[PDB]
RNA sequence: CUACAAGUAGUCAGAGCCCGUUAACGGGUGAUGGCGUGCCUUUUGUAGAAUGAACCGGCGAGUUACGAUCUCGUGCAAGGU
RNA sequence: GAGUCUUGGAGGUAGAGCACUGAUUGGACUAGGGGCCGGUUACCGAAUUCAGUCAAACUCCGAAUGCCAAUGACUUAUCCUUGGGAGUCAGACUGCGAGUGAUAAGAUCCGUAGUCGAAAGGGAAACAGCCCAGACCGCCAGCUAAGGUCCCAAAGUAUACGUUAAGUGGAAAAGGAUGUGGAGUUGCUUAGACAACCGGUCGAGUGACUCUGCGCCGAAAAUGUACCGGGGCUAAACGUAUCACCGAAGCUGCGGACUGUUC
RNA sequence: ACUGGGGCGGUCGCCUCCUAAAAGGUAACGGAGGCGCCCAAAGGUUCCCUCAGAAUGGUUGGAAAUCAUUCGCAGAGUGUAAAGGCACAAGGGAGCUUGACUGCGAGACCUACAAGUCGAGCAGGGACGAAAGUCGGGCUUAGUGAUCCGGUGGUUCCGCAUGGAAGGGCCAUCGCUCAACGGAUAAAAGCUACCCCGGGGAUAACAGGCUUAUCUCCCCCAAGAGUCCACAUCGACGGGGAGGUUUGGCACCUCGAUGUCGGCUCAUCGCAUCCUGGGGCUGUAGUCGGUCCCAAGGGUUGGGCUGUUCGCCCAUUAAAGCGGU
RNA sequence: UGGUGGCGAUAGCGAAGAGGUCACACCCGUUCCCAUACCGAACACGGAAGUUAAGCUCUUCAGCGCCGAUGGUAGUCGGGGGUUUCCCCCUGUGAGAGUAGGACGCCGCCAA
């Protein structure tokens, strides 16, 4: 499960989603992508599910680059308390996609397969995905 | 009704506020003494006829309009000219 | 060169800015017309308010 | 005027009927139409399912003294009392 | 004094970037460590290097705005001082920028603009805080705003070209689908495709893929239809365009009162 | 005292950063840290200087002591937190010193006040320097506390008939974890279910409302299980909703009273259906079932235990539904 | 050439050449002033046998660093709209990156 091995600050404001990527709009490592279409946070959770979905699709054939990592804390209070009295304790680990962001890349497998297993990743994600190539 | 006990925090401190930075514009006519700048440090240094204190504040040492300007490559100054007289 | 300034939409629910440029036209009442010399002053001031009003160039 | 009507009770519109005045682009009543959630207090916000008053009448709350100060007025004025 | 134009300046946000700090992906590469004999391995690896991500407390950079001034100009009438008299120190919602919260709350806490508060009128069925707009009085005059024009209900059963068949309009997601409109790419096809029917027979298309408009399913709550205000609507819905008209206590007209300024 | 009711926990003044929306300012029991000093040089001045780290060589001697060379915007240092600064150094070294001066102070910043900050320049008398000049502590920004009262030193001041004195004044300075840090007193803890008054829905407990984390239900993907076979049945890792019966969050109505659990009596509504009616699929031979679809017409037991809701149990039943009001 | 200034490294690094009578250096000494936490290395005082090897001076170069448009894009003031963690439209404004390009110095004063 992807965590960072440390960090600055364990406790971190949430931010905010607006634009597009930044970077990482092209599949770059890869042949073939899954592409962002909608922002959200992306779990550590989803992301090995979504690994898991196409690695095991492609038998651990090829090779998958995941593009995004999970670096940004997030907290949460115990269940039932009020509010205040300190911020919540970390509960996970959260990367932040924005549309455009290719969130993973798949090579050494056809295209049919490539498409085929990152299908299967999509619906391990909170968002709206399209298959991409490289160029 | 019953309510989870709740924990505290160990921050809640800051210090007051400086009011530091720019206390008269470029262009402004000041009087000898009048405070140019406050700052930590030489964010921004002594030009013509303005002095350093002892905390960093940079003050015009003649009466006469304030220029702002560039000094060399990264730096700043601020320098303060007698009047058309 | 003159430009007549009609306000043709209420100060009420406006920026006080808005509202003060309005009135630094003249125009204190709504459908009520300003004429004043066209220039960069007076262009700017309707440049800021110019969903506010209409210009009519005498 | 009123027994097919949904009403903070009025208001504006309005026939009909009955009157006739401090004589006025009058008075009474009101089919029907439009609009319309009392008053007060307290509130971010009260038609309020918050508070107060059954109704009517009477009574019922910034005063006076002595000091201070300011404005205004008057008398006299480097004096005034 | 203020607004606007012009000119100068301080400042590190949005964005962006990796130059620093921190995080971090892949490749090349190995110092070193671990299994396995001073010897070797698909086990991890610091540095280095190539490429690639990210940041409230990173910055080689860096706006729009806002702010401080100067200078006239055009505009506007405020502004300052002293003295007398207060009230206020429970705010609310809305939009935008943040925190707290679960990027919940008609939540809470700041910043910023508005409205309510202390604001009646028109619209949003009803509805402090939304949209339009500020009520000195009178009028059985007129023009407009938002919002509207089939009937309730004032004004278009307007015009033109399209879309929708779901009462969608008139509440909802992942996801699912030969719904339907428009674009575009492309495989194959009278050297006869695709389907049917023993690779050959039969006579014009047939099959993918991308983008996009509008719909469909997903869609179960408690007194009674019960998110169109109702009737009802296939336009009286949606998109685009155009013009008429209605529509307020806005503005105008006519009459009256008062306040202020100037003469 | 603050307090997302109060109690309990935590906090209370000062400094630095972020939040803070590129001037300044700006909240929360928001996110991070420091302070209540230290230094007689770690101050002043004059003069000289350059750091981390690495590579390579070298006795002891290593990964790393001291030596040498080379590379080396700083990757160091700057008493101490952080930020802003600093390599013509504000960093390092040496000589001489005490300006870590007295009287002040044009003018500014900051600011409700009280305070707080900067300051050229003038005079006195100095330190260092050949001079120019710099010096009123420290790279900057914490290291502190009003008044009253009292002590100590100084004093061309006052001295209750006069001379003194007592005592006071003025200048200097000392005594506060007065830390709840603008300090109520020199001097202060609890219980009240025996309680009372003034108030508040400004503020909690019931019910309602908003929210829906939690809860109940329904879905998507399909890895697996199911001899084989994802999809009879079950469905991991993940993903999306609905509902508003749970526990809560919020504190919007009600504290000049909205009686508060369970039961009894009387129901009525929803359908996510317990039974009965109609079906599809089945890992449906039959009899039984499983699962999904339609369906709310009617029906849906009596006891033991417990205040109980619930639950377990006995005995039945076609069935012994789940929820709202 | 040497001294001494001003100008954002367009001035710098790095690389390859060229030059020295005078000037600037290195260079040669430690009696004297002065000097080294040890050292005439440096600083200081003196000298001229040697040498352009280095500094210094002058050419060439775009490998590194630096400067740097235009266009586009992000963002955004104002005004609207929506399917409202966000997005779209319109009059303005407008980066950073990237790039075309510039650039291996420009301007004084004094002395010889
Ligand atoms: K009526
Ligand atoms: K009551
Ligand atoms: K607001
Ligand atoms: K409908
Ligand atoms: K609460
Ligand atoms: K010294
Ligand atoms: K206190
Ligand atoms: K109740
Ligand atoms: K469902
Ligand atoms: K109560
Ligand atoms: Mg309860
Ligand atoms: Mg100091
Ligand atoms: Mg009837
Ligand atoms: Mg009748
Ligand atoms: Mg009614
Ligand atoms: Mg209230
Ligand atoms: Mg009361
Ligand atoms: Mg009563
Ligand atoms: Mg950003
Ligand atoms: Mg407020
Ligand atoms: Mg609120
Ligand atoms: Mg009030
Ligand atoms: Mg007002
Ligand atoms: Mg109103
Ligand atoms: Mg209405
Ligand atoms: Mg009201
Ligand atoms: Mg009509
Ligand atoms: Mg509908
Ligand atoms: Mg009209
Ligand atoms: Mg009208
Ligand atoms: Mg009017
Ligand atoms: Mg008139
Ligand atoms: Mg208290
Ligand atoms: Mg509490
Ligand atoms: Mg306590
Ligand atoms: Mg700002
Ligand atoms: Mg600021
Ligand atoms: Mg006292
Ligand atoms: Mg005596
Ligand atoms: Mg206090
Ligand atoms: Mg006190
Ligand atoms: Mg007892
Ligand atoms: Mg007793
Ligand atoms: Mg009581
Ligand atoms: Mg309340
Ligand atoms: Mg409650
Ligand atoms: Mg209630
Ligand atoms: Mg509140
Ligand atoms: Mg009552
Ligand atoms: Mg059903
Ligand atoms: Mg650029």
């Not at chain 2, 009087?31 to 013509?48: C, D, F, M, N, V």
């Not at chain 2, 003649?62 to 990264?74: A, L, M, P, Q, S």
């Not at chain 3, 808005?18 to 262009?43: P, S, W």
Request: net charge positive; no cysteine.
């Amino acid at each position: 499960m992807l965590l960072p091995k440390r960090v600055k600050y364990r406790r971190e404001h949430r931010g905010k989603m607006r634009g597009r990527a930044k970077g990482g709009t092209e599949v770059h490592f890869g042949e073939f992508g899954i592409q962002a279409l909608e922002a959200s946070w992306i779990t550590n959770r989803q992301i090995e599910a979504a690994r898991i979905a196409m690695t095991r699709y492609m038998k651990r054939g090829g090779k998958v680059w995941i593009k995004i990592f999970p670096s940004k804390p997030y907290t949460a209070k115990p269940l039932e308390v009020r509010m205040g009295s300190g911020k919540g304790a970390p509960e996970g680990w959260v990367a932040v996609v924005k549309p455009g962001k290719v969130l993973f890349e798949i090579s050494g497998v056809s295209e049919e397969v490539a498409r085929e297993a990152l299908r299967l990743a999509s619906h391990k994600l909170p968002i709206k995905t399209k298959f991409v190539k490289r160029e | 009704a019953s309510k989870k006990g709740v924990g505290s925090t160990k921050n809640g401190r800051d210090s007051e506020a400086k009011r530091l930075g720019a206390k008269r514009a470029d262009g402004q006519f000041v009087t000898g003494g009048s405070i140019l700048y406050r700052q930590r440090g030489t964010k921004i240094y002594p030009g013509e006829n303005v002095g350093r204190g002892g905390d960093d504040t940079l003050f015009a040492k003649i009466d006469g309009t304030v220029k702002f300007e560039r000094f060399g490559r990264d730096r700043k100054k601020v320098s303060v000219y007698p009047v058309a007289q | 060169a003159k430009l007549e300034i009609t306000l043709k939409r209420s100060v009420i629910g406006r920026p006080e800015d808005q509202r003060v440029t309005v009135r630094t036209l003249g125009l204190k009442k709504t459908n009520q017309t300003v004429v004043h010399e066209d220039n960069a002053a007076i262009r700017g001031m309707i440049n800021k308010v110019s969903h506010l009003v209409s210009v009519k160039e005498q």
